[PDB]
Design a protein around this ligand. Structure first.
Ligand SMILES: [Mg+2]
Ligand SMILES: [Mg+2]
Ligand SMILES: [Mg+2]
Ligand SMILES: [Mg+2]
Ligand SMILES: [Mg+2]
Ligand SMILES: [Mg+2]
Ligand SMILES: [Mg+2]
Ligand SMILES: [Mg+2]
Ligand SMILES: [Mg+2]
Ligand SMILES: [Mg+2]
Ligand SMILES: [Mg+2]
Ligand SMILES: [Mg+2]
Ligand SMILES: [Mg+2]
Ligand SMILES: [Mg+2]
Ligand SMILES: [Mg+2]
Ligand SMILES: [Mg+2]
Ligand SMILES: [Mg+2]
Ligand SMILES: [Mg+2]
Ligand SMILES: [Mg+2]
Ligand SMILES: [Mg+2]
Ligand SMILES: [Mg+2]
Ligand SMILES: [Mg+2]
Ligand SMILES: [Mg+2]
Ligand SMILES: [Mg+2]
Ligand SMILES: [Mg+2]
Ligand SMILES: [Mg+2]
Ligand SMILES: [Mg+2]
Ligand SMILES: [Mg+2]
Ligand SMILES: [Mg+2]
Ligand SMILES: [Mg+2]
Ligand SMILES: [Mg+2]
Ligand SMILES: [Mg+2]
Ligand SMILES: [Mg+2]
Ligand SMILES: [Mg+2]
Ligand SMILES: [Mg+2]
Ligand SMILES: [Mg+2]
Ligand SMILES: [Mg+2]
Ligand SMILES: [Mg+2]
Ligand SMILES: [Mg+2]
Lengths: 63, 203, 188, 245
RNA sequence: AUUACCAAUCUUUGAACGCAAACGGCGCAUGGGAGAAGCUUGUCAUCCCCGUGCAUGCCAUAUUCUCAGUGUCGA
RNA sequence: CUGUAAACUGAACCAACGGGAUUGCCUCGUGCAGUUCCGGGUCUUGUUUCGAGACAUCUGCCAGAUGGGGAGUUUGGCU
RNA sequence: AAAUGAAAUACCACCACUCGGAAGUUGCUUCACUUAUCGAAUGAAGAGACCAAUGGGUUUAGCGUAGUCUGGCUAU
RNA sequence: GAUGCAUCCAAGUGGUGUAUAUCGCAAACUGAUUUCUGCCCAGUGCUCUGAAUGUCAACGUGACGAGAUUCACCGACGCGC
RNA sequence: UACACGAGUUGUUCGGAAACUGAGCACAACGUUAUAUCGUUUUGUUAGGAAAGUGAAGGUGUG
RNA sequence: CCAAAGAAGGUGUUAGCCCAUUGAGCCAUAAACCUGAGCGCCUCAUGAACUGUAUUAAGCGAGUAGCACUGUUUGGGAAUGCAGUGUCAAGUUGGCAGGUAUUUGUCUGCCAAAGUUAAAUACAGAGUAGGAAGACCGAUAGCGAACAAGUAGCGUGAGCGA
RNA sequence: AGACCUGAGUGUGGCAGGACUACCCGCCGAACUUAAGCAUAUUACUCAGCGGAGGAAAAGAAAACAACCGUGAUUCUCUCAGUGAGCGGCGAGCGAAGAGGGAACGAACUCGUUGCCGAAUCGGGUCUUACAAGGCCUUGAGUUGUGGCACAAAUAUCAU
């Protein structure tokens, strides 16, 4: 709750990685049935593919 | 606190800001010697958790380690016997770079008790680990019970024997359960244990 | 690090205060500097001398008034929002050790100040170097000089918060290899 | 089997250039400030004979531009250069036969020996005896001169390289026939240790890919691949045109 | 006195560490101690002994023991 | 205009100043004695100088070909 | 919910389209950089700069276009 | 033609020819003069070439299935010719 | 020339070293190596800060 | 004679008695090691009855875990551990482990990537110190060596070796 | 014309190397042999090789086992077990683990984080019977954090 703030202020200056940047590239123009094929090969397992693909579309409604 | 913010910058290690810092600092590292004495550690967050206090008798080194798989040393690149061992380039050395880094610093600086090390930078050629070392005879280290233990003589070259965390990594420790039934306490302690031919007196 | 494309987060430290109010900012930090191990040990000594002569239950003493000059003590002065405004050093060797400092400030709306030298935040305080000084509550002898300092500095860091976070630095070419690029537009 | 004589030679144990009666490496004077923004005169004092080279080496002294000494330079001697010639090697130098005026400043169609490929390496090309290069083309927009190496293979070098003017001394060495194995003995005893050449077809099939058989024949085609491993890359290496023309 | 036990002496080397090395060789400091010619009965000239110190690496450290840097800044 | 360019034609040599300032002096005209810059062209965000240059070579990876250069092993039975 | 051929509407979530224009990533790519990298030379022995869109921010001084902490100001 | 070629080394800003610079180096063959050195490029070799010639490597691209995976494709230099 | 006992080798200048360089070696450093006892190393080392030989003001017996 | 006849040895031959031993203790020895401290003080901290009252933020280790490859390792088999490269997290609305891969769920245990830690265990190598034993060998045996044995002697040497 | 940063130089105060290696720890690492051949395999994660400590080393305080009525650091032992596990040209061969009875065991702890503190720390002195679990002077390290304290929406923390 308070550590989460520390991970959103450090996520503010730092910006998004070359994954999360290139993920939301797909997720910005359809490509969502394969944005998780990208953030699965790159990001290891497949349960953490959604929790980040769901976190970049939750980062797109917040432009 | 102060730690929460440095610890989270380094977890976002691939961003353009942290990767700029690493692109310039991986560049001075490539014009310094393999082993380099530092005054302060580059990562106080990651050093102070690995057992580094900024007292006297504590010293930090960058050690450079060439990347990539070890190549078997056979004359002319020729290996003999069974083709099990035919490969010359694809062996992997069964000891991670961080252990090799920690052991470079030990052969050189015999008056120091290496304690830990951590990742500082890697380019596509080299890889720098900052190895946290202790002067076991600075009076500060002597009279401080948090780190007296390393003055005792069983810790002279814990780096050379795989007693550091990096060594405890490639020793298959750090898995305790059914995952290390032959790893415990060591590859041979288990090997001696399973392959002794025990002879009870009364059989 | 002048050639490269300095990110808009690390650039923040190459747009420091000017010498106009920087000496003023070092004036406050200096007179509200901590006690130097000699007025510290004889301060808590009068906490026994006039307490051993006191009847009982009266030794109450604290730091008279100073600026929060550590790093993890400053960070808490910000998180608590009790630091009225914080001063930050231009350069610290693991630059990431203070990189995030000017960004949890406008998170908690503290006026921050990236100032030109940590070696000049040490001479005021007393140490050799200092990564960041925080100037919390002050006595009414000096609410005038800082109340303006907060204004003179957020006009440079908080008012600029939008353009700061979108500001790529560097790309500053040589005087040798960019006067060449002047002698060819001379050929135009 | 065993390693082959050619492979067993980059170890450089015995098969290593001798050079004890040799003078230093013969090369142009170092490309300092003086040979860029002017010239400097230098007197040729001694023309010696480095054992193992057909070209005369001329000991040229210059003055050290910065200290007070007289620095001494060993250079290969262009033919005609005699003792006491007052050689100029700079930018504004004249183009007499022996001077080292820069390559893009020499007139075109001229004759230059001891040219240097990179601007500063102190003379590499056209430096054996009688060998030389002809300047063909300057490209002042690119700043690179195309000179014709003494092998027909004409290349392009930068117009700031340096180059002597003339032909390297000792020309016509290769035309006097040796007439005896003993005059080949004394040629290579100043050079490295490769003489006599035993034919690989007269060797045993352990020491060379050609050796073996009841007859002295190369069993498989002599032309070997460019990519072939060392110890196999023997014979006509990547021969693209083969045999008498 | 012999025996037994428990503070010394402990040559030349050797990790060997002043340099070297098929040299019982060669120095640099630093004392002191011989020997003497001159010289003022003694006093230190080269010569010659004795002893200490002097290897590299590393750590700590020096009442403000010295420094380098177109690293940082300021008077 | 806009740039460092004061030099041998068959063996010579060139390396530690002139002036002005600063302090007293035989003083302030003249000077004897420490000192400072000038020049023999002021600053450089600043690479030692070039040259190539995000291409390379080759840093590391994998991949495909090639590969007696080399290794290991084999090279049945009958009669 | 009446009311059409070879096709059904106002409280509108939205997959309903040959093209038109920039944005934004991306490859393809040459153009110029240089700072990494590379090679060479060198006892690292003289590198570029008169000179102003050349950029530096130029402690500045204004002009719009602005954004504001909402008298500090900056950004373009 | 030197960021070369031949080559060493377990690896390295390592080493050899090379203190060299095509009148050179490396690599073969034949074997002094003289005299000639014929025909055969199918083969197997070297060699270039690859526009188109025929085909391939992970990588990269796509669609499939909830997902492991499937089905592709880029046919790309190479390898065929 | 065996065995035993006893003796016997005299240096300012002879040879050697102190004191040269050659073919070459390789301590250091540096690099590499799991690892070094590996490699580079006088035709001059080392990403490389590698040294009292001299000249001096001042100190000192004493009119 | 025996709380002593085996700590079974010595002595000119087979010894309980000739000698040395050995015993249950004592002058106890320094009480310089420590046995509970019987202590002894000089100082030093730190233990309770408490008046009022707060901590709150929970967070708890990143080129790490994981994944992909390919190399090794393992009984570990759609990976047991490791290594290398590419990739690279999550945050207790969690992570890992629950020996068949995958997705979707539940449940159970646990909380990696920091550190120390006795004992039981291995070893007769320094026998270092001290030993004690044997259905062992008995001088071609037992260690190579019962003795001036790693010796003499051999080998350029590594070594060999009576 | 000075601080700081990054480096030097010698002065002091030290340390490291070497020996030993039976056991132990890390890396490296075969082959003969077995498979009636042999290349997977086996030998063997062995010998040799490099390195490093100790009187033991190592391990060790659960990111453990289990699936039960649950167990509770490591190590060792008997046992599970030459295994109706399993790996394996599924051949030769290989091959553990939980549980159980034990030995041992007054065995647990401390950093970092977190919160509250913020130099109470460290080192050079000095003073005391050497008292450095302390006194009192010290910029000398240190604020780029030494040190102190607390352990959970549940407690009681916290000061006289
Ligand atoms: Mg150093
Ligand atoms: Mg260092
Ligand atoms: Mg250093
Ligand atoms: Mg650094
Ligand atoms: Mg320090
Ligand atoms: Mg341990
Ligand atoms: Mg077990
Ligand atoms: Mg052959
Ligand atoms: Mg052949
Ligand atoms: Mg020595
Ligand atoms: Mg000390
Ligand atoms: Mg000083
Ligand atoms: Mg400076
Ligand atoms: Mg046969
Ligand atoms: Mg005799
Ligand atoms: Mg060596
Ligand atoms: Mg008897
Ligand atoms: Mg945890
Ligand atoms: Mg196996
Ligand atoms: Mg890995
Ligand atoms: Mg995960
Ligand atoms: Mg699971
Ligand atoms: Mg799932
Ligand atoms: Mg779920
Ligand atoms: Mg732990
Ligand atoms: Mg006998
Ligand atoms: Mg640094
Ligand atoms: Mg310093
Ligand atoms: Mg010393
Ligand atoms: Mg050594
Ligand atoms: Mg040792
Ligand atoms: Mg067999
Ligand atoms: Mg095995
Ligand atoms: Mg062994
Ligand atoms: Mg232990
Ligand atoms: Mg059994
Ligand atoms: Mg096995
Ligand atoms: Mg039990
Ligand atoms: Mg702490």
């Amino acid at each position: 709750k308070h550590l989460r703030a520390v991970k959103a202020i450090i996520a503010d200056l730092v910006g998004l990685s070359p994954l999360e940047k290139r993920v939301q590239e797909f997720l910005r123009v359809g490509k969502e049935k394969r944005a998780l094929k990208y953030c699965k090969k790159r990001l290891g397992d497949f349960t953490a593919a959604k929790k980040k693909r769901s976190k970049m579309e939750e980062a797109l409604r917040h432009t | 606190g102060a730690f929460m913010y440095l610890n989270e910058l380094w977890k976002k290690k691939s961003s353009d800001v942290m990767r700029f810092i690493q692109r310039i600092r991986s560049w001075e590292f490539r014009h310094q010697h393999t082993v380099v004495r530092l005054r302060r550690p580059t990562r106080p967050e990651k050093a102070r958790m690995l057992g580094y206090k900024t007292k006297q008798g504590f010293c930090v080194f960058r050690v450079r380690v060439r990347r990539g798989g070890r190549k078997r040393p056979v004359h002319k690149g020729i290996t003999y016997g069974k083709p099990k061992t035919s490969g010359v380039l694809g062996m992997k050395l069964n000891k991670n770079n961080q252990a090799v880094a920690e052991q470079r610093l030990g052969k050189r600086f015999g008056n120091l008790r290496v304690l830990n090390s951590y990742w500082v930078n890697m380019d596509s050629t080299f890889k720098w680990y900052e190895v946290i070392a202790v002067d076991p005879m600075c009076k500060t280290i002597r009279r401080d019970p948090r780190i007296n233990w390393i003055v005792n003589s069983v810790h002279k070259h814990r780096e050379q024997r795989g007693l550091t965390s990096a060594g405890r990594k490639h020793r298959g420790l750090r898995h305790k359960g059914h995952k290390a039934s032959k790893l415990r306490p060591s590859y041979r302690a288990a090997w001696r244990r399973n392959n002794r031919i025990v002879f009870l007196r009364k059989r | 690090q002048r050639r490269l494309k300095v990110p808009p987060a690390l650039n923040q430290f190459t747009k420091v205060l000017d010498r106009a109010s920087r000496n003023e900012a070092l004036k406050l930090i200096k007179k509200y500097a901590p006690e130097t191990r000699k007025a510290r040990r004889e301060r808590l000594h009068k906490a026994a001398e006039e307490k051993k002569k006191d009847p009982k239950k009266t030794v109450s003493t604290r730091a008279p008034l100073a600026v929060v000059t550590g790093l993890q003590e400053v960070t808490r002065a910000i998180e608590k929002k009790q630091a009225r405004m914080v001063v930050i050093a231009n350069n610290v060797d693991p630059v990431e050790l203070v990189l995030w400092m000017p960004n949890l400030c406008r998170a908690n709306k503290i006026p921050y100040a990236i100032v030109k030298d940590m070696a000049r935040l040490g001479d005021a305080i007393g140490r050799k170097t200092a990564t960041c000084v925080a100037i919390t509550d002050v006595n009414a002898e000096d609410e005038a000089t800082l109340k303006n300092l907060i204004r003179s500095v957020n006009a440079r860091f908080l008012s600029r918060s939008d353009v700061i976070r979108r500001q790529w630095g560097g790309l500053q070419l040589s005087l040798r290899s960019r006067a060449e690029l002047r002698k060819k537009h001379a050929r135009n | 089997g065993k390693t082959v004589l050619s492979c067993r030679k980059g170890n450089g144990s015995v098969y290593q250039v001798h050079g004890h009666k040799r003078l230093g490496p013969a090369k142009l004077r170092i490309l300092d400030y003086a040979e860029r923004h002017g010239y400097m005169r230098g007197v040729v004092k001694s023309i010696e004979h480095e054992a193992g080279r057909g070209a005369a080496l001329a000991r040229v002294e210059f003055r050290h531009p910065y200290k007070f000494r007289r620095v001494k330079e060993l250079m290969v001697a262009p033919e005609g250069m005699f003792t006491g010639q007052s050689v100029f090697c700079g930018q504004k130098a004249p183009l007499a036969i022996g001077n080292v005026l820069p390559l893009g400043q020499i007139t075109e169609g001229c004759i230059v020996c001891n040219v240097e490929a990179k601007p500063g390496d102190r003379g590499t090309l056209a430096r054996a005896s009688g060998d030389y290069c002809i300047i063909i083309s300057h490209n002042h927009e690119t700043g690179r001169t195309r000179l014709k190496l003494p092998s027909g293979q004409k290349k392009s070098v930068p117009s700031t390289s340096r180059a002597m003017i003339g032909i390297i001394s000792g020309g016509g060495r290769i035309e006097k026939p040796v007439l005896k194995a003993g005059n080949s003995f004394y040629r290579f005893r100043g050079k490295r240790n490769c003489w006599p050449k035993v034919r690989g077809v007269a060797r045993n099939p352990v020491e060379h890919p050609h050796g073996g058989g009841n007859h002295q024949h190369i069993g498989h085609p002599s032309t070997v691949s460019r990519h072939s491993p060392p110890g196999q890359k023997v014979g006509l290496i990547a021969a693209r045109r083969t045999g008498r023309i």
